[PDB]
Design a protein around this ligand. Structure first.
Ligand code: T15
Lengths: 276, 11
C-alpha cells in the first residue's frame, strides 16, 4: 500500500505542485505543506530538553528511516540512544501537540550502518529505528515506498525533480508548519565541482544552478528527512534519498547532498528481515 | 517553544 496517500492518490486529487515533478520527467525558499501531503514524514524528538532533532520517514508500521548523523556524530559529542528520544508521526505543526492526530512512539533499538563514515564525508549516512509497537495508519500516517532497481534507474536522472520536506530552519526562524520544496537532480560532474568534499557513489546532489533563476534547499533541522519522487508508471511515491549534508543552505553554486537509498537497500533489507 | 506532551510517553 506504500506511496499511495489517503488524502490524494486514493481520492484522485493531485497536490498543488506534483505536476511540476511529473513535467520534468521528459527548508529554504519552500512553501507551507498541505494537510496529508507527506504522511510518511516523521519528527525525531528529544525528551530532555524537548527539542526537534531531525526529520525521518515511516517505511512500515514498525520501522523508521533517518540519517545516521542525527544519532551519532562524535565531532559534536552526539551519541543519542533509545531512551533519549521519541518518534512523532502524523504531524503538520512543528511545536504543537496535535491531539488525536499525531502518534508518539518509543524505540526498541537503533541500527546504524556498520560502515557509516562520520570521520570524513558522511558516507553511508543512514540508520534504522525499530519502534516498540506498530503505529496504525490513518489519513495523516502512511508509509512511503523504497525503490526497486528499475524505478531508481528510470527516475534518478539529472534534470528530474524530487521533493524535500521538513521543519528545519527557513534561513541559514523555524516554520510554523511543515515546509516543502521541489528540486532538480544535478549532474554528478557539477556536484563534484562544487565542493572540496570527496563525493561517493552512495550520494547524489540536488538544487538549482545559479543561472536557472529558481532556488531552494534543505537546512539544519531537515536532516534525516526524505527526498521523494512520484513514479509516472504506477503513481506511487518512492523515497530516493535521505537529506544529508550541505555547506550552508541555499548558497549559490552549492547544492544539497543526499544519501542514495537504493545503493544501500540490501543493508536495509538485511537488518529488517534479521530483526523483524 | 514546543508544547508540553503527555507524560505517559515521557516515561
Ligand atoms: C540538511 C542540511 N542541508 C544543509 N545543511 C548544513 C547546515 O544546516 N548548515 C548550517 C547549520 C551552518 C546552516 C544541512 C544539515 N546537515 C548537517 O548539519 C550535516 N553536516 C554535518 C554533520 C557536518 C558537516 C556538514 N557540512 S560541512 O561541514 O560544510 C561539510 C562536511 C560534510 C560532511 C562531513 C564533514 C563536513 C553538514 O551538513
Amino acid at each position: 500500500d506504500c506511496g499511495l496517500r489517503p488524502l490524494f492518490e486514493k481520492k484522485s486529487l493531485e497536490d498543488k505542485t506534483e505536476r511540476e515533478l511529473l513535467e520534468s520527467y521528459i527548508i529554504v525558499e519552500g512553501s507551507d505543506a498541505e494537510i496529508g501531503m507527506s504522511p510518511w514524514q516523521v519528527m525525531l524528538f528529544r525528551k530532555s530538553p524537548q527539542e526537534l532533532l531531525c526529520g525521518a520517514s515511516l517505511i512500515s508500521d514498525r520501522w523508521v528511516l533517518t540519517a545516521a548523523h542525527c544519532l551519532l556524530y562524535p565531532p559534536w559529542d552526539k551519541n543519542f540512544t533509545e531512551n533519549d528520544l521519541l518518534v512523532r508521526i502524523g504531524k503538520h505543526s512543528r511545536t504543537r501537540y496535535e491531539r488525536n492526530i499525531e502518534k508518539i512512539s518509543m524505540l526498541e533499538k537503533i541500527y546504524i550502518h556498520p560502515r557509516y563514515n562520520w570521520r570524513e564525508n558522511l558516507d553511508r549516512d543512514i540508520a534504522l529505528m525499530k519502534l516498540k509497537k506498530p503505529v496504525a495508519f490513518s489519513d495523516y500516517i502512511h508509509p512511503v515506498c523504497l525503490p526497486d532497481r528499475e524505478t531508481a534507474a528510470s527516475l534518478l536522472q539529472a534534470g528530474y525533480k524530487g521533493r524535500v520536506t521538513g521543519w528545519g530552519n527557513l534561513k541559514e526562524g523555524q516554520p510554523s508548519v511543515l515546509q516543502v520544496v521541489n528540486l532538480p537532480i544535478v549532474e554528478r560532474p557539477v556536484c563534484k565541482d562544487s565542493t572540496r568534499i570527496r563525493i561517493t557513489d552512495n550520494m547524489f546532489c540536488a538544487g538549482y544552478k545559479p543561472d536557472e533563476g529558481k532556488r531552494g534547499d534543505a537546512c539544519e533541522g531537515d536532516s534525516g528527512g526524505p527526498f521523494v519522487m512520484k513514479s509516472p508508471f504506477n503513481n506511487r511515491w518512492y523515497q530516493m534519498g535521505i537529506v544529508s549534508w550541505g555547506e550552508g543552505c541555499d548558497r549559490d553554486g552549492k547544492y544539497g547532498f543526499y544519501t542514495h537509498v537504493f545503493r544501500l537497500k540490501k543493508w536495509i533489507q538485511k537488518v529488517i528481515d534479521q530483526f523483524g | 517553544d514546543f508544547e508540553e506532551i503527555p507524560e505517559e510517553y515521557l516515561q
